Structures are given as structure tokens and as C-alpha cells.
Amino acid sequence: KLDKGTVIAAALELLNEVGMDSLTTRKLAERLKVQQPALYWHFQNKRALLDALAEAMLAERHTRSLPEENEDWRVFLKENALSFRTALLSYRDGARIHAGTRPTEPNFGTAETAIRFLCAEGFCPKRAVWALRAVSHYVVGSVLEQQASDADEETDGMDAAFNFGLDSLIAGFERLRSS
Amino acid sequence: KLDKGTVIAAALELLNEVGMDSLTTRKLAERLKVQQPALYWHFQNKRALLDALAEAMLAERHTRSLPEENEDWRVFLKENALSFRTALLSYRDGARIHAGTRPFGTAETAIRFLCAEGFCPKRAVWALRAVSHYVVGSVLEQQASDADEDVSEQAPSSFLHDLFHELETDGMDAAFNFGLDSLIAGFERLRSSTTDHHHH
Ligand SMILES: CN(C)c1ccc(O)c2c1C[C@H]1C[C@H]3[C@H](N(C)C)C(O)=C(C(N)=O)C(=O)[C@@]3(O)C(O)=C1C2=O
Ligand SMILES: CN(C)c1ccc(O)c2c1C[C@H]1C[C@H]3[C@H](N(C)C)C(O)=C(C(N)=O)C(=O)[C@@]3(O)C(O)=C1C2=O
Ligand SMILES: [Cl-]
Ligand SMILES: [Mg+2]
Ligand SMILES: [Mg+2]
Numbered sequence: 180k181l182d183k184g185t186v187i188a189a190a191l192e193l194l195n196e197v198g199m200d201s202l203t204t205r206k207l208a209e210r211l212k213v214q215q216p217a218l219y220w221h222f223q224n225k226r227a228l229l230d231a232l233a234e235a236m237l238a239e240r241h242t243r244s245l246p247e248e249n250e251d252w253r254v255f256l257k258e259n260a261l262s263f264r265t266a267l268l269s270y271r272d273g274a275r276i277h278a279g280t281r282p283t284e285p286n287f288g289t290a291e292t293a294i295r296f297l298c299a300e301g302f303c304p305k306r307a308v309w310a311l312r313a314v315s316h317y318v319v320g321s322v323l324e325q326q327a328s329d330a331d332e333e334t335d336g337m338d339a340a341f342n343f344g345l346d347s348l349i350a351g352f353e354r355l356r357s358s
Numbered sequence: 359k360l361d362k363g364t365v366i367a368a369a370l371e372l373l374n375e376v377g378m379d380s381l382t383t384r385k386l387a388e389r390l391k392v393q394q395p396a397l398y399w400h401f402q403n404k405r406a407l408l409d410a411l412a413e414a415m416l417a418e419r420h421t422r423s424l425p426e427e428n429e430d431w432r433v434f435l436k437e438n439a440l441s442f443r444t445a446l447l448s449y450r451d452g453a454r455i456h457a458g459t460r461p462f463g464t465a466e467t468a469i470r471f472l473c474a475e476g477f478c479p480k481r482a483v484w485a486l487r488a489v490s491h492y493v494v495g496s497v498l499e500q501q502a503s504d505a506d507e508d509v510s511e512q513a514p515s516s517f518l519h520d521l522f523h524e525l526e527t528d529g530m531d532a533a534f535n536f537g538l539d540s541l542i543a544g545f546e547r548l549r550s551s552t553t554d555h556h557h558h
Contacts, residue, residue: 278499279499281503281512290518294517294521305521308525309536315495316499320491321488323453327457327458336487338556340483343556344491347555348492350543351539351541351543354547355536355539
């Protein structure tokens with residue numbers, strides 16, 4: 180009866196209310212109106228659930244995972260970074276939930292497509308990987324800072340700061356794509 | 359009664375043992391061998407303590423806060439970023455505790471420095487903030503990865519398997535350095551650009 184899709188859907192809703200710190204097995208089980216073992220069947224620990232949410236957030240919101248036809252690689256990385264940022268900001272503690280996670284089997288497929296697309300535009304395999312990792316780290320760090328300050332007590336400044344750092348990061352890749 | 363510096367020192371000590379989540383008022387009072395009211399005298403809540411820890415980490419480990427005499431602004435930003443990274447890496451949940459903290463004298467001094475190196479006041483702010491966000495992001499993911507328990511072994515394709523096997527002879531410093539060098543190389547170009555690079 181209770182499928183993995185329904186659990187994730189209920190968990191993302193509950194996450195936005197309580198946050199990742201207050202999100203527990205009992206709360207999610209009570210929200211789904213099931214006993215804890217039915218939920219434990221899907222996720223044996225909190226980290227396993229948060230990993231599934233991290234994947235779900237991108238699957239739902241992260242629209243620009245892959246390069247489009249006749250898209251400049253600089254435009255792709257900007258749109259990819261903005262799309263990734265939007266996905267983390269869409270849910271409470273999105274950046275902190277994403278932190279430490281390694282790509283899933285599909286994400287490795289999309290990552291390889293990104294790496295090969297950059298390699299075709301003059302990047303060396305190593306500097307393509309570092310560029311994509313550097314962008315993801317920059318976004319996670321920017322979103323964490325935004326979500327951290329919002330949790331406590333100028334968003335125009337964060338938006339302007341993010342866009343300038345992202346454009347700078349891409350402008351830098353142009354020069355340092357290959358030795 | 360104990361001074362604010364002694365509580366902060368003891369709190370930094372516990373942080374590296376138990377972590378942010380386990381850093382309770384009981385543990386800190388038991389460590390200092392005092393009653394809990396003694397702690398509440400200095401810090402009314404945990405966020406106030408974590409704000410003090412965030413500053414204390416930089417005061418302790420962050421050595422390159424200001425540029426040296428006749429130091430190139432690009433060299434400063436790299437050494438400043440590496441010094442800031444070192445400070446956050448030296449403490450459990452370092453990047454996580456820093457996140458959300460806002461300035462002030464040293465921050466304003468760094469803005470005026472870049473402002474004298476072909477930056478515009480807004481872009482000087484954005485540049486400094488952007489660097490800190492890249493470092494906070496890099497440290498958070500590394501600290502999260504080390505706390506939550508190989509990338510070459512998971513890779514389903516031969517291309518990624520072989521590539522990650524080579525990148526495991528470079529180190530994590532190589533990856534961070536490239537992103538930092540790219541970020542600063544970007545500033546060098548976009549600091550005096552007439553195009554809008556803070557929108558879209
Ligand atoms: C394969 N590859 C280079 C790695 C290796 C280790 C990693 O820890 C990661 C990657 C890929 C990058 C790609 C980036 C990509 N982007 C540059 C923002 C991205 O759009 C995605 C995505 N799901 O499309 C990521 O997963 C991503 O955020 C990510 O989480 C990564 C990531 O964490
Ligand atoms: C005024 N100014 C530009 C702001 C505004 C909002 C902010 O949220 C911040 C700054 C300064 C920047 C400076 C950077 C600096 N650097 C680029 C790494 C830095 O070295 C320091 C430092 N204490 O030396 C920071 O606090 C800093 O990491 C930081 O946390 C900042 C920060 O969080
Ligand atoms: Cl190389
Ligand atoms: Mg990631
Ligand atoms: Mg800061």
C-alpha cells in the first residue's frame with residue numbers, strides 16, 4: 180500500500196514545516212498514519228531518508244540538469260547553477276541535506292554528459308570535473324548562508340552576490356579550462 | 359565567576375569532541391565544573407554561543423584576514439580564502455556554525471582594499487561574499503562527507519572509473535584550488551566589466 184513515492188512526498192512537506200533537525204521517524208510515521216516499521220522498511224536511518232529527499236528535491240525542481248541543443252557551455256553552467264540553487268532553496272535546509280551526498284547512478288549519467296560536453300569545448304577531463312564540483316560547492320555554500328540567516332532573523336544582496344560569483348566562476352573557467 | 363574567553367575556549371574544546379548537535383549546556387557546565395547559570399550569564403541561548411565560537415575560530419586559526427604590504431590583490435584573496443578554509447576545517451561543524459553570521463572593521467578594510475584595485479564598491483562586497491560562500495560550501499560538504507562515513511568504485515562507466523582513479527592521486531586540495539583560482543581569475547575580468555553580471 181505505502182509506496183516510496185508517497186513517503187518522500189509526505190517527508191518533503193513535513194521537512195518544510197519542522198526542518199531537517201526536528202524531522203524524525205515518529206513524526207513522518209504519524210503524518211502518514213502508519214506504524215514506524217512500515218516507514219523503517221523504506222529508510223533504516225535518518226541519513227537514508229535525507230539522501231532520498233536530496234535526490235527527490237533535484238528530480239522535482241532541478242530542470243536544467245542536461246545541456247540543451249545549440250546551448251553555449253557558459254550559458255548551460257549558469258542555467259544549471261541557477262536551476263540547482265532554486266532546487267535547494269525550494270525546501271527547508273536543502274543545502275545542509277545535500278552536503279556530503281555523492282551522485283546517484285542517474286546523476287553519474289548526467290554528470291558524465293556534462294563532463295564530456297565541457298571536454299568537447301576545450302576542457303581537460305580533470306578540470307571539467309573540478310569546474311562542475313566547484314559550481315555545486317559554491318551553490319551549496321551560498322544557499323546554506325541564505326537558509327541559515329533566514330532561520331535566525333538583504334536578499335537582494337545575496338541574489339546579486341550569487342550571480343556575480345557564478346559569472347566570475349564561469350569567466351575563470353574560460354581561461355583555466357586547459358593548461 | 360569565569361570570564362567569557364574561558365567559556366568560549368572550553369566550548370571550542372567540547373565542539374571537536376562531541377560536535378555542534380551534542381554541544382549541550384550540561385556538557386559545557388560539567389567541563390568548566392560550574393553551575394548552568396554561570397554559562398547563561400554570558401550566552402542567553404545556543405545561537406549566541408555558536409556566534410562567539412564562529413568569531414573565536416577566526417581569531418584562533420584565520421591568520422590572513424588583511425592583505426600584507428605590496429601584496430597583489432589576487433594573491434591576498436587566494437591566501438585569505440585558504441586561511442579562512444583552514445579555520446573552518448579545524449573545528450567540527452565549522453562551516454555549518456559560520457553559516458548565517460554577518461559582520462566589521464576587517465570586512466570594511468577588505469572592501470576599501472579591493473576598491474583601490476579597480477573594483478566598484480558593490481562588486482568588492484559581492485567578490486568577498488562570493489569567496490566566503492565557495493569556502494563555506496567546500497568545507498561543509500567535506501565535513502559532512504567525513505562525518506557520514508570510493509567515488510571511483512561507484513562510477514558505473516569506464517571513463518569516470520579511470521578519471522576518478524587519476525583524481526585520487528591529485529587530492530581534495532587540487533579540486534578546491536581550481537575553483538578558487540577560477541573565481542579570482544573571473545574577478546580580474548568582471549571587476550571593470552560594463553555588462554550587468556549580478557542578474558539573470
Ligand atoms: C561526477 N562528479 C564530477 C561529481 C563527483 C562528486 C560530487 O560530489 C558531485 C559530482 C557532480 C556534481 C554535479 C552538480 C551539477 N551542477 C554543476 C550543479 C548538477 O547540476 C547536478 C545534477 N543532479 O544535475 C548535481 O548533482 C551537482 O550539483 C552535484 O551535486 C555534483 C556533485 O556533488
Ligand atoms: C561587508 N561584507 C562584504 C560582508 C557582508 C555580509 C557577509 O555575510 C560577509 C561579508 C564579508 C565577508 C568577508 C569574508 C573574508 N574572506 C573573503 C573569506 C574573510 O577573510 C573574513 C574574515 N573575518 O577575515 C570573513 O569573515 C568572510 O569570510 C565573511 O564571512 C564575509 C561575510 O560573511
Ligand atoms: Cl590538469
Ligand atoms: Mg553534490
Ligand atoms: Mg560569513
